[PDB]
Amino acid sequence: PQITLWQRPLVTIKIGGQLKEALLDTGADDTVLEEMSLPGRWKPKMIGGIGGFIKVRQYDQILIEICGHKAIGTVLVGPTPVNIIGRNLLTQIGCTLNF
Amino acid sequence: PQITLWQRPLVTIKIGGQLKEALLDTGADDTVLEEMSLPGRWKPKMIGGIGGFIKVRQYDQILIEICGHKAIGTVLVGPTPVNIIGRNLLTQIGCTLNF
Numbered sequence: 001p002q003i004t005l006w007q008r009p010l011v012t013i014k015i016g017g018q019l020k021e022a023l024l025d026t027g028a029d030d031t032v033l034e035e036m037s038l039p040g041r042w043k044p045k046m047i048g049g050i051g052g053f054i055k056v057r058q059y060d061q062i063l064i065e066i067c068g069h070k071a072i073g074t075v076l077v078g079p080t081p082v083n084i085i086g087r088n089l090l091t092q093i094g095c096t097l098n099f
Numbered sequence: 100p101q102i103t104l105w106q107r108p109l110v111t112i113k114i115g116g117q118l119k120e121a122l123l124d125t126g127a128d129d130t131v132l133e134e135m136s137l138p139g140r141w142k143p144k145m146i147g148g149i150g151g152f153i154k155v156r157q158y159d160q161i162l163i164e165i166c167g168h169k170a171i172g173t174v175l176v177g178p179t180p181v182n183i184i185g186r187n188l189l190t191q192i193g194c195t196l197n198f
């Protein structure tokens with residue numbers, strides 16, 4: 001699809017057998033999802049944003065389907081206020097910025 | 100231009116007579132710039148992100164040239180770690196997401 005930016009670019013994702021909505025975020029290097037139940041091993045990590053830092057759990061090689069496109073990569077799980085799809089996955093679905 | 104997302108989508112902007120670099124950010128509702136000297140009158144505001152909140156000064160009807168495109172609108176100024184061009188200005192330069 002082509003997505004204009006008059007509203008938030010929200011998309012439906014499927015991850016770990018659950019359905020969620022997430023923001024396509026070109027300003028995010030990594031993908032960060034709200035607290036959710038994800039199978040497998042994870043490694044502790046701290047990431048920084050506009051207001052300071054949060055601790056997250058890093059899961060690698062996680063399959064996500066983003067608006068019908070499959071991708072595999074790293075997902076961070078923690079107290080983000082919104083689910084964010086970052087550039088590590090945006091590149092895999094072929095997403096580009098155009099103006 | 101068409102911008103792919105293997106690197107941060109950084110762009111050169113001119114605002115308040117100064118040249119800066121800023122991140123094209125589809126996950127940002129509003130435009131937030133690092134501390135900088137802007138001429139107008141401002142209004143205190145508080146915005147939320149990944150790690151909490153920061154206090155910013157809001158300036159309205161500020162002219163910004165973004166990769167050669169002119170836009171006018173609200174700019175928030177404060178302790179963000181990165182200059183962020185948000186959707187209030189991305190829509191004015193015709194920016195879309197495509198995949």
Ligand SMILES: CC(C)CN(C[C@@H](O)[C@H](Cc1cc(F)cc(F)c1)NC(=O)O[C@H]1[C@H]2CO[C@H]3OC[C@@H]1[C@H]3C2)S(=O)(=O)c1ccc2nc(NC3CC3)sc2c1
Pocket residue numbers: 023025026027028029030031032047048049050051082084086124125126127128129130131146147148149179180181183185
């Ligand atoms: C969290 C998003 C949902 C919102 N944000 C934009 C994201 O694009 C940030 C951009 C950013 C990049 C940085 F490098 C550093 C930063 F400080 C900020 N991305 C990020 O936090 O990424 C982080 C983490 C994610 O992976 C890596 O990539 C970068 C790092 C890192 C770990 S925002 O900044 O908080 C924002 C902007 C405008 C705005 N307008 C408002 N208006 C009111 C509602 C009416 S609310 C509001 C909120």
